[PDB]
Design a protein around this ligand. Structure first.
Ligand SMILES: [Zn+2]
Ligand SMILES: [Zn+2]
Lengths: 234, 117, 241, 284, 348, 209
């Protein structure tokens, strides 16, 4: 909870693949400060420079019915405090009632310009499938898993907003991780291996373009990995 | 009084919004997507408890008795089963300034009784 | 820059630079071990093998009373008896079974969740398991460790015997330590009487440059910090060759 | 304490226990069962435009504790609501004899319910039942320190420190507070030099600034010759305006480009000097 | 006893037997009471330690001399290290409602909250050690942080007042020649020679003021004892001298009123250039003045000398009315002090 | 809100009388120190009804040095004073051939009115004051030292003694509350007399800007 900000409470999640895609796609699910009918819940998704209400995200994931959305966010319908705290975001995002419309909304808010709604929608769909909460899964048909996790994130934001839970301490070392030589060299090796495959791609491209074979022994610039690790550690 | 719960439509499972029958002057809950309507039964559409009269005994759960880090005492036995041992803890919940009140839970299995002194 | 309470046993409270990097540059404690990382696939298979229900198989109505189960932060499913589930996972870790010792298992009770972690970088330290109000480290263990050069009985065998357990900072929240075996005895007024772990030795909270300080518990902490900073500047024999 | 209550800002939310919106079609038979006693006492005769009535009903419940602590009355609350919302919002309320203080509000004639909820959210905070705005809380105490005691000269000519009640407010509303009954407008002061300069004047802010500096230095028991503080205050108040000790106060005076560049904004100062063809007299 | 009292306070708080004090939250009140008890206990133990200290104790020797250390130091070495505070508060619950895993949740006892009951010589238990380390960390951070801000402040002050200086006409002007102060420090005096002194005609009541400052020239016996026969006869007979003395007292009374208005509070302490008391003491020693013998210094001479000296002392030079008003204002306080101290009755 | 309205009106009249007396206008002692009861007896205690009406509080005082140099004090009834009201006051001042007036507004004043006060400045020097700022006499505050408007001859003597220009003295904004209280304009010098803990009394001089 930032004292000086437009948001009262912010539930973030630096998401990363179990053992790949080192860049940690940070996703935020914030609540607008009381200062308007109620308190609105939004989500600063990656590759999008504009906040989006959670309800659009849930509908873009294939859960259009508001009952299904609440079933994913609030697990106990016997909590009228929870319904009253989630009501403003629902009332603020109801004109959208289909997955395609929600995806188009996301694609319209995406950093990339929506030259065509089709590309725009596809842009979003792949963002919600790859960038949003990658640790939960980047494959297809996992929208249920992503919906449940985002619902739990909203549940955590509501528990913090209603005070039934304590805010998380940024200094608690149980909430920290130590990147040792292993993960550090792994991050460098990944980026440098990518650069190596890049140089090999360009080499083989400019050779096959002449209609002839190419030698990987000559394409593989071993100096990339060698001098890279050497420079970083030096 | 009590809070007011959300009513969901039976066709599209969307939320029903309050509306009035201008001709009959009666409260209805109508769906903003389809043309469904329901006759209200509470007549109240909004309740905000500013004083926050919350009974924390409802937030407490019997499972807290299994926490080894909580203090135990033998001076307050359980009234529902008579068990002597019982864990006690503070509210520690935000929006409750007078949190020094102690809440007890019975450590007996299958009892899970909760109370306050 | 402040010395957070969670640095107990994981980082040296004294060893830190006094310049413009106070509190930022830290030093591991003597018995502190940073986890290396492990695959969660075996844990996931064990959880599925037990009564856990996957997240897509359940109905939202079942999530209310059930206990959520996370693995490396991924919500995998829910469970009904988290008490015996945690008891089982702990027995497996204490038996060096499917769950390896570096795996963290924190059961939040108030929120009804079981966070399991196999991630790397989780700073943790060893602790003596205490079952009733008695230590699992019996005298036969000390005997075997005394004849460590003959019977090849090492720390690994001590951990595999379920006498010691690697506890991380996040699990220390759910752990009730006993500073010394004296705290496990019956006193005129029982303080805890429900300890679950014990400290091997409190001096292990100190780091390397702070461990050389004699009677550091008789000095003002700034002094111990300045010594932790000067022991590295002291002359000697930095290496034999 | 009366003065403290009259000065400390109070909103409706402070004294409001809860609020609820009901679809009450006919007030004659209120949905609630406890208001029925007085609703009839009020609707037995047509006092307002019954025709222009809305079934939507805003019922607010107050709390005795706060109500008494602030000596506020339902009549006062009703008058404030009527003043702020005009006649469009009809307001009735029970006397201060029921165990629970409840007032009912209707709209005369966005949807009616939506507007009612909006105005409810607005009134809970905006409406100022009493007190001066910007003053969140007021503290009343007896100054143990003589410096804060009212020193008076006795008939025999002896200094006597009368320990009288003093109020310390968390906000700064000097303008309004000084113009208040039973509030001494001579001694009462503010720590906000900006406010002092705005209300009293350049000389008054000079004095207040000197006091503030002296207090800051002396808090730890340090002593500095008064002349130093006086000189600093004169430097900050020699142009008739509060010249902050920053680039925004030092580089804005006709001190010559070289000195300003020596302080901050070197390139900008020289650039502007070049553009305006300024001449440095080489006095600094 | 201190820990027992803290336990009783905690018990009342848990039993809802503690009401919040006015202007304070219930939790704040609890913390205030607990801290009060702990502080009082620390103070009592420390005082006991100092009283136990012998004259030969080296800690006592250094502290008494002021060379190094303080009673607090002695109380943390010999009695109780005290309560450790982070951010001006008892050790926070870094864990879930626990400062350390060794304690239990919702534990507000002195030990759990970081009350080091052991002295340095006794040795600190591991938890006490950790909490003390926390407090030390706080101090180290403050020391390593304040520096930057203080340096920036000093730089800004310098850049904003580097050119202000005292001109040959005795006025304080900046580089632009804009008059900042007519006289430096409003008195045109250096900051080194000035020294602390006390005004003898500010606090005294009217009765004491008159009994101590109005020269009594009607008491022949008193005049005989204080002054020599020739002075006594001259004072008694001559009426011009008596009138001058009365005028001098009236001037002192007016100065007293001026001092009252200048100082609403009764604080006689003031910084003035010359320590008149010390100078008079020096004069007594140098001239071997014997206090038990009648003085030969005529009071009329005293009055004339004070007025002449006052005229000689000139911060602002000029016979025009503006200059002479500025001079009068500049030396007003010092002149009042001069007349009060050099009062003929006091000098007699 | 009627006893409080009459109380405010009395305080404002008292402050205005003190202001005119400090500016040097002839104000009798009885009206300078008029109790609330005397004010109610001379004007009334029902301003809401219209007794006294704010128009009846209008003050007209004359300078001690020049009897024909009068000064007005108007108390408009409308909360926000408009250009038409400024024109009405300008008409009355033109009729009575008076050059100084004070407009005691309640809420504030319109931009057109401010523009009229600045464009008509050289002909009629009319000032504005808020009743909120007239309910207290700031000059009685302990932080405010004794200000004294100097005469052009005394300013000439000051500059000739200290041998300095007008732009060398410290400045005081024309919008300063004390400058407004004493009604001083650009170019005038105000002498401030303040107590000093090091010298006893210190006199400084500020030029208005
Ligand atoms: Zn529907
Ligand atoms: Zn029970």
């Amino acid at each position: 909870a930032k004292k000086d900000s437009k948001y009262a409470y912010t539930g973030e999640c630096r998401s990363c693949l179990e053992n790949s895609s080192r860049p940690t796609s940070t996703i935020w699910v914030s609540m607008l400060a009381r200062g308007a009918i109620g308190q609105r819940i939004v989500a600063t998704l990656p590759y999008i420079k504009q906040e989006v209400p959670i309800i659009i995200v849930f509908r873009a994931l294939g859960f259009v019915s508001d009952r299904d959305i609440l079933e994913h966010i609030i697990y106990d319908f016997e909590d009228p405090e929870m319904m009253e705290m989630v009501k403003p975001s629902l009332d603020e995002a109801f004109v959208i009632q289909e997955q395609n419309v929600a995806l188009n909304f996301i694609g319209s808010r995406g950093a990339k310009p929506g030259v065509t709604k089709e590309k725009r929608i596809k842009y979003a769909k792949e963002v919600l499938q790859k960038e949003m909460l990658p640790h939960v899964g980047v494959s297809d048909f996992c929208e249920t898993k992503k919906a449940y996790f985002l619902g739990y994130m909203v549940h955590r934001l509501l528990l913090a907003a209603l005070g039934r839970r304590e805010l998380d301490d940024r200094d608690h070392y149980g909430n920290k991780r130590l990147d040792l030589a292993g993960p550090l060299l792994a991050f460098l090796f990944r980026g440098m291996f990518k650069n190596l495959l890049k140089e090999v791609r360009i080499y083989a491209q400019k050779f096959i373009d002449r209609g002839k074979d190419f030698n990987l022994e000559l394409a593989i610039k071993t100096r990339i990995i060698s001098d890279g690790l050497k420079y970083s550690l030096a | 009084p009590g809070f007011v719960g959300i009513r969901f439509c039976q066709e599209c499972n969307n939320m029903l919004y309050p509306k009035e029958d201008k001709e009959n002057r009666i409260l209805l809950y109508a769906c903003r997507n389809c043309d469904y309507q329901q006759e209200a039964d509470n007549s109240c559409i909004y309740v905000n408890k500013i004083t926050h009269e919350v009974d924390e005994l409802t937030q407490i759960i019997a499972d807290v008795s299994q926490d080894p880090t909580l203090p135990r005492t033998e001076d307050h036995p359980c009234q529902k089963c008579g068990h002597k041992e019982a864990v006690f803890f503070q509210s520690h919940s935000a929006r409750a300034e007078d949190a020094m009140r102690l809440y007890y839970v019975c450590t007996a299995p299958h009892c899970g009784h909760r109370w306050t002194e | 820059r402040q010395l957070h309470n969670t640095l107990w046993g994981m980082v040296c409270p004294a060893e830190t630079p006094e310049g413009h990097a106070v509190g930022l540059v830290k030093n591991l404690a003597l018995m502190a071990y940073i986890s290396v990382g492990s695959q969660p696939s075996p844990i996931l298979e064990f959880l599925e093998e037990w009564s856990m229900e996957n997240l897509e198989e359940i109905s939202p109505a079942a999530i209310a009373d059930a206990t959520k189960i996370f693995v490396n932060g991924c919500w995998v499913g829910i469970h009904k008896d988290p008490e015996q589930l945690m008891n089982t996972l702990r027995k497996l870790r204490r038996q060096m079974d499917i769950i390896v010792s570096e795996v963290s298992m924190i059961r939040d009770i108030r929120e009804r969740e079981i966070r399991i972690y196999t991630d790397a970088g989780r700073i943790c330290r060893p602790l003596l398991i205490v079952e009733k109000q008695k230590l699992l480290l019996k005298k036969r263990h000390i005997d075997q460790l005394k004849e460590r050069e003959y019977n090849n009985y090492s720390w690994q065998d001590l951990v595999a015997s379920g006498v010691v357990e690697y506890i991380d900072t996040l699990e220390e929240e759910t752990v009730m330590l006993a500073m010394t075996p004296d705290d496990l005895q019956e006193k005129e007024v029982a303080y805890c009487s429900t300890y679950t772990h014990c400290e091997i030795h409190p001096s292990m909270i100190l780091g390397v440059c702070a461990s050389i300080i004699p009677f550091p518990d008789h000095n003002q902490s700034p002094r111990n910090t300045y010594q932790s900073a000067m022991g590295k500047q002291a002359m000697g024999v930095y290496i034999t060759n | 304490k009366d003065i403290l209550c009259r000065l400390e800002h109070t909103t409706l939310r402070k004294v409001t226990a809860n609020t609820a919106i009901y679809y009450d079609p006919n007030p004659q038979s209120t949905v609630v069962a406890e208001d029925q006693e007085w609703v009839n006492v009020y609707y037995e005769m047509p006092d307002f435009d019954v025709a222009r009535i809305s079934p939507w009903l805003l019922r607010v419940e107050l709390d005795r504790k706060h109500m008494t602590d602030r000596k506020l009355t339902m009549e006062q609350i009703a008058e404030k609501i009527n003043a702020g919302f005009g006649d469009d919002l009809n307001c009735i309320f029970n006397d201060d004899n029921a165990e629970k203080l409840v007032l009912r509000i209707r709209i005369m004639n966005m949807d009616d319910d939506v507007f009612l909820r909006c105005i409810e959210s607005n009134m809970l905070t905006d409406m100022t039942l009493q007190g001066i705005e910007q003053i969140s809380k007021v503290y009343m105490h007896l100054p143990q320190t003589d410096n804060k005691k009212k020193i008076i000269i006795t008939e025999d000519g002896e200094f006597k420190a009368l320990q009288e009640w003093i109020l310390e407010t968390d906000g700064v509303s000097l303008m309004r507070v000084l113009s208040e009954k039973d509030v001494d407008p001579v001694r009462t002061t503010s720590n906000d030099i900006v406010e002092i300069f705005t209300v009293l004047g350049i000389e008054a802010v000079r004095k207040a600034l000197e006091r503030e500096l002296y207090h800051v230095i002396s808090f730890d028991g340090s002593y500095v010759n008064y002349r130093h503080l006086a000189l600093l205050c004169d430097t900050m108040t020699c142009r008739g305006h509060l010249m902050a000790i920053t680039r925004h106060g030092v580089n804005r005076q006709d001190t010559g480009p070289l000195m300003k560049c020596s302080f901050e904004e070197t390139v900008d100062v020289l650039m502007e000097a070049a553009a305006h063809g300024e001449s440095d007299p080489m006095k600094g | 006893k201190a820990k027992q009292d803290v336990i009783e306070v905690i018990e009342k708080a848990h039993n809802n037997e503690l009401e919040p004090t006015p202007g304070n939250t219930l939790r704040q009140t609890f913390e205030n009471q607990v801290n009060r008890i702990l502080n009082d206990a620390r103070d009592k133990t420390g005082s006991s330690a100092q009283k136990s200290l012998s004259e030969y104790n080296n800690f006592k020797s250094m502290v008494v001399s002021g060379a190094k250390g303080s009673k607090i130091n002695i109380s943390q070495v010999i009695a109780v290290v005290g309560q450790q505070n982070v951010e001006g508060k008892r050790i926070p619950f870094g864990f879930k409602h626990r400062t350390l895993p060794h304690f239990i949740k919702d534990d507000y006892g002195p030990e759990s909250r970081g009350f080091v009951e052991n002295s340095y010589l006794a040795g600190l238990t591991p938890t006490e050690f950790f909490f003390h380390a926390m407090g030390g960390r706080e101090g180290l951070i403050d020391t390593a942080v304040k520096t930057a801000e203080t340096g920036y402040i000093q730089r800004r002050l310098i850049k904003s007042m580097e050119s202000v200086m005292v001109k040959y006409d005795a006025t304080v002007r900046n580089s632009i020649n804009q008059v900042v102060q007519l006289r430096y420090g409003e008195d045109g005096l250096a900051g080194e020679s000035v020294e602390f002194q006390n005004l003898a005609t500010l606090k005294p009541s009217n009765k004491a003021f008159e009994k101590k400052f109005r020269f009594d020239y009607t008491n022949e016996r008193a005049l005989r004892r204080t002054l020599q026969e020739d002075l006594v006869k001259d004072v008694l007979s001559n009426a011009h001298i008596q009138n001058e003395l009365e005028r001098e007292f009236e001037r002192m009374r007016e100065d007293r009123e001026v001092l009252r208005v200048i100082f609403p509070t009764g604080d006689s302490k003031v910084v003035l250039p010359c320590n008149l008391l010390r100078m008079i003491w020096n004069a007594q020693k140098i001239f071997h003045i014997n206090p038990r013998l009648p003085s030969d210094l005529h009071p009329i001479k005293v009055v004339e000398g004070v007025k002449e000296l006052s005229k000689k002392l000139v911060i602002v030079n000029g016979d025009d009315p503006l200059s002479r008003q500025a001079q009068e204002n500049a030396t007003l306080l010092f002149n009042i002090h001069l007349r009060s101290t050099l009062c003929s009755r006091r000098m007699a | 809100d009627d006893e409080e309205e009459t109380y405010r009106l009395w305080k404002i009249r008292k402050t205005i009388m003190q202001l005119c007396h400090d500016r040097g206008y002839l104000v009798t002692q009885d009206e300078l120190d008029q109790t609330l009861e005397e004010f109610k007896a001379q004007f009334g205690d029902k301003p809401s009804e219209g007794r006294p009406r704010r128009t009846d509080l209008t003050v007209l005082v004359a300078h001690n040095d020049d009897p024909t140099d009068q000064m007005f004090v108007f108390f408009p009834e409308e909360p926000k004073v408009g250009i038409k009201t400024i024109k009405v006051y300008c008409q009355r001042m033109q009729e009575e051939n008076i050059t100084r007036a004070l407009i005691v507004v309640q809420q504030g004043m319109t931009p057109s009115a401010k523009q009229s006060l600045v464009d008509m400045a050289p002909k009629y020097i009319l000032e504005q004051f808020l009743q909120q700022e007239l309910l207290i006499n700031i000059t009685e505050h302990e932080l405010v030292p004794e200000h004294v408007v100097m005469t052009k001859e005394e300013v000439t003597e000051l500059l000739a003694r200290y041998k300095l220009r007008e732009n060398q003295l410290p400045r005081i904004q024309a919008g300063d509350p004390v400058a407004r209280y004493f009604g001083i304009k650009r170019g005038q010098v105000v002498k401030i007399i303040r107590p000093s803990e090091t010298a006893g009394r210190y006199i400084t001089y500020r030029l208005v800007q």
